[PDB]
Amino acid sequence: MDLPGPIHEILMLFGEFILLLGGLGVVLLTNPIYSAFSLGLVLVCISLFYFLLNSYFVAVAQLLIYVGAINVLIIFAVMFVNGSEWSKDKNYWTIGDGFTSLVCITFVFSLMTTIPDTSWYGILWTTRSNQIVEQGLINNVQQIGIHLATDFYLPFELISIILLVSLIGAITMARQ
Amino acid sequence: SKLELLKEVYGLISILPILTLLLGITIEVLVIVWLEREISASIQQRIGPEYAGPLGLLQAIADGTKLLFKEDILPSRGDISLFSIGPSIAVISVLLSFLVIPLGYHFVLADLSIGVFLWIAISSIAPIGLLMAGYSSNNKYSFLGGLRAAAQSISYEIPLTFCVLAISLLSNSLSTVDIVEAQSKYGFFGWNIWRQPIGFLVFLISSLAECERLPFDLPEAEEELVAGYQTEYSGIKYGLFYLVSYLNLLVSSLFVTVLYLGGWNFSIPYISFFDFFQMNKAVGILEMTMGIFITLTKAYLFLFISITIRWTLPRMRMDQLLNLGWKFLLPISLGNLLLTTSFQLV
Amino acid sequence: LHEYDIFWTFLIIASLIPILAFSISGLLAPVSEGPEKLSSYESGIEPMGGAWVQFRIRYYMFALVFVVFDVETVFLYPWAMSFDVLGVSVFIEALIFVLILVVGLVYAWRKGALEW
Amino acid sequence: NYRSYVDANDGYSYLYPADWRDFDFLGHDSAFKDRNVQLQSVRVAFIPTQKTDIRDLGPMDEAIFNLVNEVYAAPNQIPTIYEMQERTVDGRNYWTFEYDLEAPGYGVSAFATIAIGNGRYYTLIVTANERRWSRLRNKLKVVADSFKIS
Amino acid sequence: NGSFIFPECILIFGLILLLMIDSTSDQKDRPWFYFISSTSLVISITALLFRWREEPIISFSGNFQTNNFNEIFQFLILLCSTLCIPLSVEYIECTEMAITEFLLFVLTATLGGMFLCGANDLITIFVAPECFSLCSYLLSGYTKRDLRSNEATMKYLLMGGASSSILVHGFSWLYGSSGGEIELQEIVNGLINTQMYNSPGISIALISITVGLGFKLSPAPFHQWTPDVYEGSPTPVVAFLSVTSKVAASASATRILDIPFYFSSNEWHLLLEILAILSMILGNLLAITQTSMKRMLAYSSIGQIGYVIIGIIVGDSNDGYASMITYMLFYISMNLGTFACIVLFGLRTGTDNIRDYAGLYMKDPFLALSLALCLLSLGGLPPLAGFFGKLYLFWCGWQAGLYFLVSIGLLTSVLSIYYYLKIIKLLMTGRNQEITPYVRNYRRSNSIELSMTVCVIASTIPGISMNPILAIAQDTLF
Amino acid sequence: ARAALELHRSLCPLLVSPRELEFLQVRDPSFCSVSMVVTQIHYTARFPDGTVFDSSYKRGRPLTMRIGAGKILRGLQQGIGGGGGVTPMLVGGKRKLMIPPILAYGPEPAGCFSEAVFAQAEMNFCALAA
Amino acid sequence: MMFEHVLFLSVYLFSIGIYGLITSRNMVRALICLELILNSINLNLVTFSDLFDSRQLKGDIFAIFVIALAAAEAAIGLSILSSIHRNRKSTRINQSNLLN
Amino acid sequence: PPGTVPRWGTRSYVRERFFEPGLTTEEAAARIRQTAEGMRTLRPMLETMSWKYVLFYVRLKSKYLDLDLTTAMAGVPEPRRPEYVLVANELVDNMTEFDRFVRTPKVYESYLYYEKTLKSLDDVAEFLG
């Protein structure tokens, strides 16, 4: 499987520009429900990023377990925080806004200059046997299907009790 | 030379079949609303939408065109920031599901080995749009009117999943075409609805509330406040909501028949329709139209069953609906899988 | 799993559909309705004001138990696909998996969580 | 076993037993697969390779091993080559052989065949899951015992 | 199909039984499960007794671990839980809270900690810290009607989410740069056939891992979350955390930093040092000014004492790990003793602040003595155990060249003597008109007594009987 | 980055025997073979003529890899686990290799803002198991 | 620019995810930003498991586990939010420093 | 047998071609000849269906040989060089079709061009030097 052609980078840039505005809406808007809806938009436009790259399961699942359950749960939660419409006008809060918008940008600069010095397209040639197998005849719901249970046995056996404990704790806490 | 791209300017995609599907689904929406307005209000009543020509064959698109103008109002509290954004998610959640739905022998739009999984994933995006729409305004009768439906919808996808999986484990696939492949063996013995009727019951009862049936229990009783979160939505907005409702109904019927029944299989196995004559000449258009034929009728049967059930039970209140969806359907929809595990153990 | 180009074209077309319909409605529409237009309907009282209408106490438990019990399915799907491909070990593994959450559901049932 | 399809590609003409929902896997021009189980029967793929009859690619037991262990394999597998046989039905010198690819869990099997006639080295294959490979082996060999060209 | 999880399969069995009994039984549980859980714990300890003197055999498809050194910590966490449960039974008993799911939470957290001690998988060593952290925001807030127990859930959940985030981002950077690899042993291969090792990148995936590690065991620059939570949560879970969290984190850190980081030694040996030199300073100064007992314990016994453990991880040529094992074995006891004494006195009176421990020597002298012993041991005085702990930690660590870490350690130990002797002085007094009417009404007087008395003599005897412990701790190669 | 310093000897071998794919050479076979499992070797890699760019001795424990599943240079996996026409190396064995540039990284380097391996190189090894 | 332009957006989200975390005032916004950071790391993870490691997927499984644990944490945090809003009748985060 | 010359890899394809501007004649003559012995290594990876590298490598080597072939050919013998331009058409249409027959993975056409794509590239570089 593969992609159409030079239409690729078009959708890439489009989704990137959508996701940037989505994140800015998540972090800027004061009305929390608008923030949650913009978060849902961010997550669907990142599910589309997952789907563009030929990884299908980790896209559709991510769309089902987040753009579904988690967002409606958060919407239900925002029905418990009262009092909105705080101050505004260019870092509404204290100087902590400026201090953050400084340190975060330093973090950016660091990682964003570390990355464009590693030849990723050269780190792909040195591994020409990893993605050269495909097991002989497999599709990409059986790859995960088997390789989840043939060697990832212990964490799969583990996650269930984590889920159960989280359920029990959530019910015991939320209930008065 | 080949400066940027020779054959890759725009000539790799055609938008003919997609528009054909659009025309077909719109026509089928007209057919199903005609079915409703001519059978539901005609059991012991007068005829349905007469005077719109011979019969209401033009009445449906007439209501569509009327709703088209209807001066969309856009109330003050809440605006285009979320108002126009609301029904878009609703309509797309069911429109995109038409991808993996087949219609006949080699008429699928995309193989998409994660097909039914994609359908289940896209079925659980509507509640987001419903909550958004119901909250796009400010007053009540839309906030709680949408909250009720968005909440009760969440209480049913789990039986949907534990009935779709009890068929995926039988067909050993996730693409509809392979599902109907594993079902065209014995004509109608091999049909999964007989092999797993306990799952079909759960799927059918869940499908009702999953496509908002019923959203209001009575022709006089409202959709639990004054209306189902579509009060201020006057023109094309209520039109799109009417659409998305009918389309959820359609997709549910098509999926239950393509899963538990032979998709485009006759009552005699689908391959057997060729061998007993020793030769075929022009079976192409015959099999195409007969795949549209033998499939759409099976879903029509469920359309009619739902239409009848509409006038036989008082749809429960959302004090009993949650109880039924949680403490009744979940245990049996788990037990059928627990059974079919050892059943498919061989 | 060969060509999702039809999927992408259907995505862009069906995403243009709603904005196309909205714009078509807007073109041939009335530039009118400068009336009150600040109150929604089925409230002939011309009412206004109010908040704290939540009742989240009940539905929040339903939302939580659903969010927790959902993760079962996206783990079962890779198992539900790989039953015959692999042997019968995955059968016992997934049985342990599902039985854990069956016990969890039994607990949520006994202690009052799923209520009116 | 029962059906006999040239598959109209002007080349091969081989057999396939039963219903065989007729997938399109990646080896183009033909494929066939069962319903209940996975990892099923014939697929065939073409290549251009302008050499002559297969006997030119080297000795049988060595040219067979340089691809049953380097191409039809994966670094996360162990291959095992069983019996191998020439055919010479029209001087094409086919190479039919049955091998196994054991994996962490899979353990698939195969009855590969090869030709070199005017179609330049296009090959066949069959397979089934190991838990049931024993009960239908002789049903699949007659499948491989069909490959001729035109 | 494997017995290397049976030490944890027994724990899972006990977990399922504890969950079942509340579903089926009516009211016969309160003193019943109180020992039924101890049965599961002691049976798991007996199961781990078998695998003494075993092979480095690799796990299920090579997933978590099975060697000698890892088995030591696997048993040590069980020891902590066995000593801790009797404390966290009666405390929550005298709060009218449901007790079943509390013991369930403690058991599941112990299970996560036990699995973490191995986990050479890069994914198991990610889920297991969550299996240990997801069962931590519950306990650390499991008194809902209180107010402080909510602050020590907000400023614990936010922090433990951010830190695990940073850690997993470092893991993703490593998985990327490593040409694609998870198995902990098989990284220095894969980071070579992909020649991107000596390049920037790895230098980032080292810091983004070390920071997430530090937060879990709280050295100075990231200690911020510890002093608050330890005051806001109930004292038994404070003790449980302050023992098993540190044990599990220090068991995971040495393996995650020694196996896949051969080359970067000279660039993380320094790094950890910068933490230690701060951890044993900022965790002591504040400890002086404290007036609450739990918060002072957070500062001293954790903010600092997580210093000299690390004080050899940097200076380790496999001749030191024995000293880390010995110091951990000393610290567990010399910390659980004082926590048992604090739980007992707090329950018997109803106060936490220091100014109420006056006169306690006259009312009940046994408890005052068994608390003074553990406190002095924490101080590190010659005949006790903490002295020999710190000693063998320095003697191997001065024997490894580095000098500007042992001197600071001794100096901050001298400094730490202050508040220990302060509370000790507050014990011994007889000025009747000074003691508040808290110790004045103290009806002096099973489980907590047994735990406190069998945990305090292990804070005096092993410091003099460390010969077999030392002979045992030398066989660690990991 | 690029080459750095080191120092060692080589224990001069006999003449290499190419065996039609690579350059093989044996120094000392001692104890026993190794299956498709984790191994632990000590290497010292050269350039074609003289230069040395890495050596397991330049770190602590000699690195540990997988001999039997493709996770390493095809040349090595052919010359350590035993390739077609070559006997595998024993537990305490010791061999010397000259890797042709087809069984190696091939005709493209591994860049890090400066290729750490000369583009289209063919290197040498002195591999001693342990 | 597939393999290169996406990673250039990982940081450009991760950073934001931290900032909204720090400057957050209400609990639900802090939880939203936490989820956002986890999704950032998820995205930074998946692409690595598509360029290489296609024989045995080692990233997609890890992505699945990350999403599962994210859902669990988002459940537990909101559950705690219920109890705090029960105790005090407002969830202003930065106005509770009685533990210092 | 000493070391070699890296010769401008070194970047992340956003530093190169976007931010480190430089390309001299007879230097593109290195990239052109390099993608000939370069693209002649996918034959084993076309034997086994590794449909995920036969796209990335082709995209990269193309977007590299879609600018050099426009710079290098300006610097060949300019008196007589219509053929050195009557080859770029072939050497960039054969590859433009190669990129088609890998998107929807075929085998016959993919391999029938994976020979008639390198057979040409040995002639574009031929007119250079």
From Swiss-Prot, chain B:
Record keywords: Hydrolase included? no
- Report the transmembrane regions from the record: 15-35, 89-109, 114-134, 150-170, 188-208, 233-253, 289-309, 328-346
The record describes its membrane topology as: Multi-pass membrane protein
Report the coiled-coil segments.
none
Tell me what reaction this enzyme catalyses: a plastoquinone + NADH + (n+1) H(+)(in) = a plastoquinol + NAD(+) + n H(+)(out); a plastoquinone + NADPH + (n+1) H(+)(in) = a plastoquinol + NADP(+) + n H(+)(out)
Task: Name its cellular compartments.
Answer: Plastid, Chloroplast thylakoid membrane
Instruction: Identify a single GO molecular function assigned to this protein.
Output: quinone binding
Q: Which InterPro entries match?
A: NADH_UbQ_OxRdtase_su1/FPO (IPR001694), NADH_UbQ_OxRdtase_su1_CS (IPR018086)
Enzyme Commission numbers on file: 7.1.1.-
- Any one cellular component term from GO for this entry? chloroplast thylakoid membrane
Q: Name one GO biological process term.
A: photosynthesis, light reaction
Q: Which UniProt keywords apply?
A: Chloroplast, Membrane, NAD, NADP, Plastid, Plastoquinone, Quinone, Thylakoid, Translocase, Transmembrane, Transmembrane helix
Please give one Pfam family short name: NADHdh
**Which enzyme class, named as a word?**
translocase
Family, similarity comment:
Belongs to the complex I subunit 1 family.
Q: How does it assemble?
A: NDH is composed of at least 16 different subunits, 5 of which are encoded in the nucleus.
Q: Name the job this protein performs.
A: NDH shuttles electrons from NAD(P)H:plastoquinone, via FMN and iron-sulfur (Fe-S) centers, to quinones in the photosynthetic chain and possibly in a chloroplast respiratory chain. The immediate electron acceptor for the enzyme in this species is believed to be plastoquinone. Couples the redox reaction to proton translocation, and thus conserves the redox energy in a proton gradient.
HAMAP family on file: NDH1_NuoH
| This protein's name | NAD(P)H-quinone oxidoreductase subunit 1, chloroplastic
Task: Tell me the organism.
Answer: Hordeum vulgare
